[PDB]
Ligand binder design. Sequence first.
Ligand SMILES: CC(=O)N[C@@H]1[C@@H](O)[C@H](O)[C@@H](CO)O[C@H]1O
Ligand SMILES: CC(=O)N[C@@H]1[C@@H](O)[C@H](O)[C@@H](CO)O[C@H]1O
Lengths: 625, 610
Amino acid sequence: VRFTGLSLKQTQAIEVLKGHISLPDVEVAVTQSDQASISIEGEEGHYQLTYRKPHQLYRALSLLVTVLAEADKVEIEEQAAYEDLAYMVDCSRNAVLNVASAKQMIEILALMGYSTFELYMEDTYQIEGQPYFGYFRGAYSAEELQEIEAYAQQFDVTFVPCIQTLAHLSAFVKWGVKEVQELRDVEDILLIGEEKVYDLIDGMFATLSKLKTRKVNIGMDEAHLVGLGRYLILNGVVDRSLLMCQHLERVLDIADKYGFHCQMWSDMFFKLMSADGQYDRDVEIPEETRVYLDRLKDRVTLVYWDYYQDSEEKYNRNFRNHHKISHDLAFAGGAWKWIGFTPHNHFSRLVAIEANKACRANQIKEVIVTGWGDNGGETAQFSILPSLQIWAELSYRNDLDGLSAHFKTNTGLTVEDFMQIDLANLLPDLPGNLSGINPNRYVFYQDILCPILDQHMTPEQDKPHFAQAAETLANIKEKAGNYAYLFETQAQLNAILSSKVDVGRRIRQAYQADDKESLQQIARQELPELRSQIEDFHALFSHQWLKENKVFGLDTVDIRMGGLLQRIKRAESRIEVYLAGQLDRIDELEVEILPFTDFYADKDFAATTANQWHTIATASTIYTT
Amino acid sequence: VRFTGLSLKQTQAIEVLKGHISLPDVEVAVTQSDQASISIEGEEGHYQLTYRKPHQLYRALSLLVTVLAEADKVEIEEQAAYEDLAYMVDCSRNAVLNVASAKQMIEILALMGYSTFELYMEDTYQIEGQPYFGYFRGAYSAEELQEIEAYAQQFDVTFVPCIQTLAHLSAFVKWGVKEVQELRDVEDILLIGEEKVYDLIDGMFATLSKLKTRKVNIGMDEAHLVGLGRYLILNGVVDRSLLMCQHLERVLDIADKYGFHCQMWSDMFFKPEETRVYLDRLKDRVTLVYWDYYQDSEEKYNRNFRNHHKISHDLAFAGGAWKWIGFTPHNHFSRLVAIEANKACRANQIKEVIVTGWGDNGGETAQFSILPSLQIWAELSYRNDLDGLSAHFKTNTGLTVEDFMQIDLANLLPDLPGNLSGINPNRYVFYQDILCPILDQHMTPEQDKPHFAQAAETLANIKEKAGNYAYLFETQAQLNAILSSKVDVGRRIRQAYQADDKESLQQIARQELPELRSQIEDFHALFSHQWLKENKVFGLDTVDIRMGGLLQRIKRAESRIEVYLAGQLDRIDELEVEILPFTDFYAKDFAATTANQWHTIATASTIYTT
Ligand SMILES: CC(=O)N[C@@H]1[C@@H](O)[C@H](O)[C@@H](CO)O[C@H]1O
Ligand SMILES: CC(=O)N[C@@H]1[C@@H](O)[C@H](O)[C@@H](CO)O[C@H]1O
């Protein structure tokens, strides 16, 4: 290609992006213009390209490459619905995105049209004088954060840290030293009102002030027991909505000291002022609280987060409730990658289409796409590219007509191929519109002898589904280039699930039937092979993890998978003891299996949602004293 | 041995106890008498033996066997200080004592002089119509509880169930079904005021009423978050002491319905005029239990007794047989505190002592690990001294009390003050990671390595003397063998790495760590044999998970070193993190500490949280 109008910064950015896309040999005149987010016009190898904001050059080039593969004449104009579109990576659930992968992610977000890159870090950034904060977690140094931000700046992409200034600090407050314990209210919540807490928070902002950015998400979601622990012991019973405002004021004051403009998750206002303590609800605002909120609302952007609703009207109602507090709002949607090993791009697509309608209908200026990693970060960081492309398409075009072509330009894969990554969750009898159904994870981590999720399995449909999935994913792996690792991991997982889905039930059927030959084959053949397959899965998982993330946090997966392997060994040994006539009965197998949960009991499929490792793996105590 | 004066019941009991003690070739005349708890006299192969309470026959027999080893003429008289002496086994922390082992424990308690046997069961007894209560936990059936109680009765020992009627029901309330969730306030706490909660509690007493006993410990400590969860959302703010009162009244009413008389922990009374009056009313219906496992001085117990007596004189004392700090008990520390507690209980007219055998965080210590602590409490009750401790112990077990107490060794680091509780290197040295050894500051390899090595040899020798108890010492010998190398393996990896001594890193990765894994798998085998001997199979799974996890982490240490050695890694990031103190709890002229949650020993990462 021959470009005119480019700055050195822009030519360098394009050099980097040539690692993702091939620019045709054509002539392109590039200028900034307020006329459109993106405009591309021309024919016969001579083109005029304009962008409104500098970062939008990179989506413009993605569109260019795409459109020119087919046609000679180009007529493209896009007007983005959102002033800012962000992707937030969870770096607090054990998986800290490594610097090299943050760079890759930035390049991709640039090509997609995102303005903003965000990292969610509860304790995973280093604070001078707080040596337990992020200790052995791979917390980013100030230097690493600076390097990441400066790399985003190469593409005119803004960096926004998402931190926690109230709750969700469990990995820090666990440390049994005076300087940490003195900071606690209860659970994962800091002690409102305590000077040492505000010293800590001043440290947080001191660290972030080393960056160029002066935009921050300060957290404050999900502090359900706020004011009810050591706070209650010291202060007695207080108005908790005012308590929230008091803490918020002090944090905004600290932010001000460093020149930051803040956003926060909105849920605690709703939980503390609704009838049943829930988010998705209307609120009675006490007068003294209203007055306090009327001040504070001018100093912070409230972020309404919702990853779940299947209809615009459901989001709309919540936006309406938020308007009672503030018209300075943003929306956080979901790239579903927090339900085990396997994402749910399909469900993310369904909710994105409807959330986009509601955001537009409520003149929402910013959408943050969230990539949470609940309970260990076991899903791949790059597993949700389709979901990111979907939101970009919805902002820029208000439809998904360009989704597959732009996605193929950006990744080398069709969007439908890449979205097969979801397969371990896609049981055939599920409706598309229910969230969190995650057999990928609970079929994997379930015990053998004591399979407490067995009532949720449907082997006649699930076995062939997982088996077919493994073949499909093996095929996509072969044409996935640099993303092949993602698919190889999923293929092996599905291969394991195909047999593991009912091995526990088949053991019980054979035991009840006195089919000792079957018992023997399971214990001597099937289970040692299952261990072999799990060890291979562990290797592939580790390869994936170390490619994307820092090493810290992988230890939890080692522990979990080692435990699973040992429990398979126990199934083998207990069966052998019984077969050698050294047991009259195998007591584990005499316990009748109950439903694990009734969450989806009223629905016409067996699968469910089960997303805590420690309750998947055992009915015994493991966490409690 | 020829006896006169025995019933059929007593004859059969003695026949069982021959499994434990060797009755010499003498004639013994047995009668009940109020003159003493135990009296024995006679000479030249003719003896007169008296007991006050029927169960005390069995301690008397142990005393008799003992003295006659030494002498012909006997003049024994004991007056026990406590009306009741109980041992309470924890069956809620994953380890549910199996029926055969409960029988063994009863036999030993009878020989020692215990009047009462207790099982602590949060969710580990079955309630008809509550299928999730004890599900996959090895919950005792009604019939199993009856059989255990009946066995105790064979020796005139009474049974007391220890249950929970408000909080500490974590293993039950986790179940995500309507019939369970509607019973919940928050965390491990049931929902006060909910009629379905009182339906459950009625169910609890319906099960226990199948027993002969009408004495129960109902739990009822003061959990901080009572009233603060789904209670707060449903009902607004209430005085939470007043809430405790309302719930306690309902529980007591249910217990009355079934004829039970209740004990409970004294916590909620420790300390609004509405509340004072309510508390005062309820205190008349219960015996309070003051529990203390920690104090090193009678003076400190006495202070707490005085304070309790401002609340109620209807008071019992719970002491501690330290078996809740990992794999290895602390009989030594239990002896220290028993001596002082006994002084204080006597000074304050305490009528009942309950020795507690908690199994905190997985039940990994052997059920029979604390026999010395139990004999200690018996001697203190009956004789007010330990001058006959070892001789009586050896009659009962085959082992001197000093030999048996070597079971503690994995905790007994040389530079520890004997009077500080919960220092448990047995556990955190074992479960600590290799690459990220977050307890390394608490290790003193130059002292700890030979201590653990010498312990393993000592324990191998005691195993040979231990008969039916050998399994306990075999387990502990192997643990100490492991800890001798593991205590500093992470540190030696860091040293070799920092010195760029690749030969040493290779030796550690290729020889030492695979051998460590082999040793841990050996320990796992021995531990499993020990567990299955003493306990139901349920709960063993948690140990399998924890140990399989540790093995996999040792594998990671091997593989990370291999990749580095091969040039495919510029650095091993885990090894570049400076290790801080794990806790400042005992920050001191020793480095050891207390760390008793597996999940925080094993990783600085999240593992339970969302
Ligand atoms: C602000 C927010 O969304 N908070 C939590 C988040 O930590 C969790 O990871 C996510 C996905 O389950 O949803 C919420 O429960
Ligand atoms: C009444 C009582 O003793 N309650 C707990 C008990 O559940 C625990 O196992 C034990 C040993 O640490 O100490 C107490 O805190």
